[PDB]
Amino acid sequence: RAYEKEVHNVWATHACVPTDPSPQELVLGNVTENFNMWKNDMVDQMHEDIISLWDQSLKPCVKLTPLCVTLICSDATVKTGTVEEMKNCSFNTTTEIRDKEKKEYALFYKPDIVPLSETNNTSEYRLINCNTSACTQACPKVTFEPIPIHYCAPAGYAILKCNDETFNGTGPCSNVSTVQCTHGIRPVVSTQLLLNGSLAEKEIVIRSENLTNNAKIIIVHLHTPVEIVCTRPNNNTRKSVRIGPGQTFYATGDIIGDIKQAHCNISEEKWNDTLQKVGIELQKHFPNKTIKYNQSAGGDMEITTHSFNCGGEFFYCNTSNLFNGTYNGTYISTNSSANSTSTITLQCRIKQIINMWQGVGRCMYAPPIAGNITCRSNITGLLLTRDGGTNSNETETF
Amino acid sequence: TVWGIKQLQARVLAVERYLRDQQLLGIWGCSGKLICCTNVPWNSSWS
């Protein structure tokens, strides 16, 4: 289906073989087979292919080697809070001619820029990545929409899949069907939440490799999706800067209108009901222990905050008050008594420079996008860890 | 290295195209000869 005037999706899905016929209905019957999805080989192939696609897509684009210079920076917002992350900066670019240096200005985010070494609280600034590695901006034709991908085995091999609805990732499946190609899974890049994923069929599934070891990561597969809105409201403008012979740089030029906070919106009642049912499914795995929903442990901004992208811009959302409250008893929230329209709103921040996959991949400077960004999504699953404290004899924390 | 890539593609395509109908003749069991007697009646709709 993904064949149009545009072929430069970052996952390069146009080059794949088109699946002409219907998907196979090849149920076997009288077949039992043991499965271990924590030992599956295909996930490592998927991770390697995503890394290789990222490298081969970011390879021919424009580099940012000459831009890493001394930056003289000052305040950009007239405020003193909320949206104070904007800063203004000036520098010296190189024109087409080598001997002609030109004074230039650009706007930046506060997480992108770093005050220079041995500063006397001065205006001297630099980029974050300049003492780590190089960086390349993304080409503006590149579209980051998660087009679905069907993995297929070669001829002479086969793909067996489980059909048992309560299959929690281990154990033998009574209902096993073969198929030529996998279904339309999506390469959605996110952390701490699953977006646009395949829904659980009838029951909220908890998958963990050991369930008592806290080093294992609990995968929570929700039965019903939770719809989430995310937006950056303020009107951004894109400017262009000539750097070197025949290649251009893009940056944030100006903001039009009153600046408002980038945020996300979640229906609070459905989220609490989902957390309540997850607490039911977890307390039936951990009897006589009240669980607690608490914020994640402290660490990096990319690790603590829920990170994703919609459009070409990248979002990092606070989510501390999202994971709040304790579930005890049996269905204590009672859903609701009235027609509540309560929406929990998460504040979010935006980075331009990302060292995605923890530096295994490559640096990218995401170019800014004019206008505004709005994006809608379904939360279908959660990534949780068991904070197994000593005083958790009855009050467990996740 | 462009011409080498094309030669590799050509040889792979030739091997596949030769093996396909040989596999079909092996399925029909009359492989190894150029003319096959089939024991299948010719339907009148084709006639």
């Binding site: 090849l26 076997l28 001829a155 002479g156 073969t178 | 596999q23 092996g26």
Partner: peptide, 26 residues
């Protein structure tokens, strides 16, 4: 394809050829 994987060896004697029919298709 593999339509008699759980059956006896007598039953697979009807199906087995179409398994070979998928050994090079695509």
């Amino acid at each position: 394809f593999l339509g008699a994987a759980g059956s006896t060896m007598g039953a697979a004697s009807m199906t087995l050829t179409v398994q070979a029919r998928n050994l090079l298709s695509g």
